[PDB]
Amino acid sequence: SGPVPSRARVYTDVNTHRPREYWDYESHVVEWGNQDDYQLVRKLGRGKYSEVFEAINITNNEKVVVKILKPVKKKKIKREIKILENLRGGPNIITLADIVKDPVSRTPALVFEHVNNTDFKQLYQTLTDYDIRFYMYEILKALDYCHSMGIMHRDVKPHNVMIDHEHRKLRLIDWGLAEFYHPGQEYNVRVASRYFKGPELLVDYQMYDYSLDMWSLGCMLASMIFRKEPFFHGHDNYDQLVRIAKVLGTEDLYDYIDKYNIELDPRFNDILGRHSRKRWERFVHSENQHLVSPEALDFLDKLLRYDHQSRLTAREAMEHPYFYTVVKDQA
Ligand SMILES: O=C(O)c1ccc2c(c1)nc(NCCCCCCNCc1ccc(-c3ccccc3)c(Cl)c1)c1ccncc12
């Protein structure tokens, strides 16, 4: 008869109450600066939609990052631009500094603030239980902010979180998959990295909301405190749901399906099976116990839920006991 609809249980109407121009990005007009103000120094990394360079602004001699965009639909470029401008200034959101086009190739590029990225190779062994709480809280500062601004990020993952540990500075980057939230809108489920896709993505439930981001955050936290990168190591989109089902159990998954009347792809009909809801203690071992704790496991369990309505919000997460220590130190 159809899927049951869903509404975000926070920030539901934030966008309706704004002027059309806030979220109607398709009609945004963009001011292309001259790429010749910036000279590229070196390639800092590529990806599916872009390549990133360290660059220098020749007018003020300042270090900077230029993100040249591989061809995407014109709407998506305006979308990312509109969203960085609405989010500009917000806590731990990367700052868009300029929007330039190349003179000859006419290909567009966004110019961002430079962040001395701390080497994550040596950062994986000098990570204390406090540092994970501290930097997890910084991510929620940014997630709660953009959720409160009506924007879901949809691509939270390690490669999209930068840390300058020297100065305890964190930045949430790549907003090219982010969208505005609009009650009742149906979204594209083919988003995010495969290991961070939320169950609502894998069962093709299009009416999701900010809580999508909390699942991803739960996948990161789990890989951190258990030192298992990635925590749900599926071999494709279908098996990714099975890898989740082997940890969360099937009983809750089929409950979720019935609650929202989601019709399950028949490809799933013979690979899910019957699996119990495991206990988090299974994943705890000598090399990772120094980060696992009763609070962390409680906080993790309240993030990784099938039903997107029941995951904590970003604001609820900050008020969890897991962060009681970093919240007092910020005083
Ligand atoms: O496209 C954009 O908008 C954009 C904007 C600006 C920049 C950009 C892209 N790309 C840059 N270079 C790409 C490098 C890859 C990121 C490295 C991943 N970082 C691991 C990592 C560590 C620790 C944790 C963690 C989590 C929880 C608790 C403790 C630690 C996590 Cl989760 C991940 C860049 C460089 C310099 N300046 C600006 C930008």
From Swiss-Prot:
- Where does the UniProt entry say this protein principally localizes? nucleus
| MF GO annotations | ATP binding; Hsp90 protein binding; identical protein binding; kinase activity; protein serine kinase activity; protein serine/threonine kinase activity
Q: Where is the signal peptide?
A: none
Q: Spell out the activity regulation.
A: Constitutively active protein kinase whose activity is not directly affected by phosphorylation. Seems to be regulated by level of expression and localization.
Q: What is its EC number?
A: 2.7.11.1
- Record-level GO cellular component terms: cytosol; nucleoplasm; nucleus; plasma membrane; PML body; protein kinase CK2 complex; Sin3-type complex
Q: How is it modified after translation?
A: Phosphorylation does not directly affect casein kinase 2 activity, but may contribute to its regulation by forming binding sites for interacting proteins and/or targeting it to different compartments.
Outline the segment boundaries, as ranges, of region: Interaction with beta subunit: 35-40
What's its catalytic activity?
L-seryl-[protein] + ATP = O-phospho-L-seryl-[protein] + ADP + H(+); L-threonyl-[protein] + ATP = O-phospho-L-threonyl-[protein] + ADP + H(+)
Query: What does the record give as the active site?
Result: D155
Provide the binding site for ATP: L44, G45, R46, G47, K48, Y49, S50, E51, V52, K67
Which branch of life, at top level?
A: Eukaryota
The protein depicted here goes by the name Casein kinase II subunit alpha
Q: Which gene encodes it?
A: CSNK2A1
- Residue range from the parent sequence: 2 to 332 of 391
